[PDB]
Design a protein around this nucleic acid. Structure first.
Ligand SMILES: [Mn+2]
Ligand SMILES: [Mn+2]
Lengths: 163, 163
DNA sequence: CAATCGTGGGAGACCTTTGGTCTCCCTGCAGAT
DNA sequence: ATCTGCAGGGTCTGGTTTCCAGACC
DNA sequence: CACGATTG
């Protein structure tokens, strides 16, 4: 039936698949905040919760969420934000009645044969245009890869296959 | 009327202050989970949300939460965990109808004179015992420092003063 | 189970299959149009 | 406003402040 | 602070 996919990161997105085959994808809401005399994007908690309350996906719907897995060579700040974004989404999803299943990125990539691409982001947008042709207008910019990760995650939990 | 204090860490706690002067403090609910073939404690999102749902504190109540601010000499795992707890708690608090106010540890410590102690944790329990005498038995143990921090954050937003 | 200490650290999934291998982001910031 | 590239990074309060001291998990 | 470890 209904499936939710969540790319939890700052350029990420939430994708919702209804049982009639239609689909929605939203950019993750963010705000600009001061940290240590610079400005930085942080997910917008209030907006995210308002969004999750405006979905028609019923309680108990499974939200598939990409497990943040920072590399040992990423910075401590990178570790912090990805932990923070992840906790914010998990808690907002659990609080809004949705069932949360974390999925490793290697899981949904191998499912769609996206492993070992020279152009992984480009390829994700292309595979999501294929799976969701009405969204292809909304998938043409490189910055849109996060929308494509969400849609693909949702595609994975829903069982869809590339043609 | 009502004030909430949150020490969002694994050994932290949530403290709720009534207008009638009573107080409760709960340990943060955790679960043991597998990470990279070892066992690690993580906050329990479902138990947290349930706890927040059963509190008498009415909506709009302010929760004062300690800003996580890890040290640069702390490891990337510490940065990830603190960021995640923080995000889990903020999101759970906003979804439970409460208004979240982040408070740095320098701020409430300065407020209660706790700065630059040799035994910061002991002093916190002692200060929380003086402010919440009926919690005196809940602060006997050295591992009870999280209950203290949580209570002191709530006393801070409450405008309480030491004798 | 309650304290203490000391350094600061990947994690995941699937095969080669009980370990060995291999794969995966992101943040933050500085120039680039 | 989108892009790219590349290394991996503290953050906070407050001061008779315009950066910096001194503090914190 | 986390993360492992020891030590009661
Ligand atoms: Mn993403
Ligand atoms: Mn604490």
């Amino acid at each position: 039936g209904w499936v939710i996919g969540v790319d939890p990161d700052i350029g990420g997105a939430i994708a919702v698949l209804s049982p009639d085959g239609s689909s929605q994808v939203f950019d993750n809401p963010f705000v600009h905040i001061v940290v240590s005399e610079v400005i930085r994007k942080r997910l917008d908690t209030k907006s995210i919760i308002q969004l999750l309350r405006g979905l028609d996906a019923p309680p108990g719907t499974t939200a598939y969420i990409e497990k943040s897995s920072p590399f040992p060579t990423d910075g401590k700040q990178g570790w912090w934000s990805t932990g923070f974004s992840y906790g914010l989404w998990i808690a907002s999803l659990v609080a809004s009645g949705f069932s949360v299943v974390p999925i490793a990125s290697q899981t949904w990539k191998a499912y769609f044969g996206l492993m070992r691409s020279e152009t992984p982001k480009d390829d994700s947008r292309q595979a999501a245009s294929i799976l969701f042709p009405d969204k292809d207008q909304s998938l043409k910019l490189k910055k849109h890869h996060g929308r494509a990760e969400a849609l693909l995650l949702a595609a994975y939990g829903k069982g869809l296959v590339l043609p």
